[PDB]
């Protein structure tokens, strides 16, 4: 139970990637508050978890709004929610080749994946800071470092957030605060399949569960060593 | 003179890094279009090139105004200038630390130094496509790569810069176009005589050859990739900074 | 708690990273095989180990000498021990300028930190493919990444084990084989003032780290849960470097 | 120019890119010295730059044997030329699944295209710092970076070359010396010929562009980072790929 007492953020966590974070994080002992867009999938999500025998928190927030984000705040306040450990799961696609892609498509992706990890660890970072005890995770992906045709918004945002995390890193080292990402290759969440695999060494598209031990395995007091790192978790399909 | 029949486009061309790139590839026989803010300064840059015998012109461009990256690239149009060589020299920094960081430093920095490279690379690609061939080369920063506290915002974008590039190279690979950044370390600059005794004597600690570089650094490094012998480069960050960061 | 029945060689396990990693994944249930290079050393591993209620066994080994890496799978063979989970820890400094380095510290460094990894994984790749399972996991070194001046063959030896773990990751990933490198930053395990001085100044928070650090990451690779992790470098340097 | 008066070391110069890179220094102003394994490609070489109007000597060099790396040197130093430039172009490849390599198939490879590394810098780090003034540019590859199957000795020793750099970049930066390392990626060259039709077609498609390089496209790399515009530039690993892999 290294996480009894600690509470941990993750954002959409209704599904996939996020969900599976959430399983893994409450596992560890953790308190969990997952988001979704909608009160329903918040509510799915708290009833599900709280099923499987966990404490978690459903609450509502779009992360590429301000307003919701500054009203989501100001309910974890008022439900006195210190958060401890800040996952960045939720993000947005809009592809198209670069030279067709039209500025609600380039802002969109740079406000939803880039923006977004501002304005979530900016709100998180004090709390964190005054405990003298933190981490922050953000999912990037595995385009952030080897780019990516005809996402040319999304590679930016995902390098952003590494570049982003790299820098923090270093402001809030000496509160005992990390700051990584974890970026996933292909993952689960049509075939194609068949075609995909022939790209990764291990010859399978990953599962949300792989990505989840890896934010469990940094978010844990045994990682405290690790900050500014990027963990590929993508089969072999990219290799730093 | 491999670039005796090619257009080039810097921005911020006036002094520094954007004025020697301007020199370094004229020299090689571009003809340059430089871009300041100003009216006087724009003028100020087309007079000094063609005093040195350059081709060169000067226009008013401010990159963070899509209203005026409309303008600009209209005025281009009618003079005939296509763009074969484009080098954002463009950015700003906004540096504080991330828990004080404000609205306007953060989205600044971001629009300035990340989401206008995005806007002026859409408005010259069509153009190189169709003639299969064209130079992209974004001015990034060692701190991109490295991180540095107090620029969560310049590392996320110059980061992004990167990231933005990998991606497009593979677009425009087919039509023999390249895309790559050149990234600075310690280079001798307007903004860097900012600094104080202080912190320059700070950076000068992390410069395994204990020289601060000079633009002409920057510039030879934007032009060789410029340059017809560096087609076989793409999406590609070169750094350039005295052993500071090592790749 | 998923070790158990997993069997795991670690070299150069007599004390530092090497003994808590051995500790970390017999904490798992892993049988741990633990190597030095003397018989009391082995002994004494083999003895601290089994005293904690771990089942282990120290061997001799000295992992530079091919001679003595013959033997050492000789003996594991007739001890009918296959080794799912292989952690290439042991090597050696010989620093000096480049300028000065002698052929006999270039040689040293680059046979005893590069050379084993290829000489101690194709003994034990056979095993794991067979079985489709297995762990390759060695320990590096931020100076492979970062570059360190006085150590160019000990900084080409750590960059060389990441250029061989990616290529071997390619050959076995099909076989559900990982292999994958922790580099550690500075860890506690007789601290130089020019060290001293790096820690204070490349180091965020000014702190040298602890072999359970090392450990703990070593552990979280080797485990089922990292099934997907593979040809990485995972640095554990309190952000001394970042990739 | 910036090359007049300066003496270069391009080992396994005979042909591809050691020939090109060669003919690359030279025309820069550099004297070349080249090497080859035998007489009589020794003596080829020489005569094939001599006859493009250039100072070249071609000695013979079994980088392998230790005691050749020492006749060698014995041989240049009695003739007067003194190695500012040294570009580590020798290596050899004997690929093989790891589970079915030889002590010989590793070792060669690790011997030729490491260890070759020290053996070479060591006998001219010396004069270049004396001088303050040199370049140390080893030819890598692409795998090195990226990983391949079959190949975890060339893999291994083409990283070892990136690392032992980067550690020499700090021993010599303030002496004026950089240390950087290119990376070619699919380039034409005897051995790629060797390749079947469907072999070279594969690679192909991991290339953007989907073209083949060629020598000159290492060997303009490689003369700019030797030029005196490079000065600022050391520690780097310079891809040199068509977007195969980028860093």
Known sequence: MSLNEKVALVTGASR???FEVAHALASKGATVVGTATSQASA???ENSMKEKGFKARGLVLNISDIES???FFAEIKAENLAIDILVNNAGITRDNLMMRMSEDEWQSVINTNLSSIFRMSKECVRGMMKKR???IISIGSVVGSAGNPGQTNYCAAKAGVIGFSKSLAYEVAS???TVNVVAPGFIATD???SFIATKIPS???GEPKDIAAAVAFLASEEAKYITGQTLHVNGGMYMA
Do not use: A, L, V, Y
């Open 133 to 135: 005890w933190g981490r």
């Open 43 to 45: 509510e799915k999500f």
């Open 16 to 18: 996939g990637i996020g």
């Open 191 to 193: 075939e194609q399949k």
């Open 69 to 71: 984000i500054q009203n």
């Open 203 to 205: 010859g399978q598209i």
């Open 175 to 177: 509160r005992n605060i």
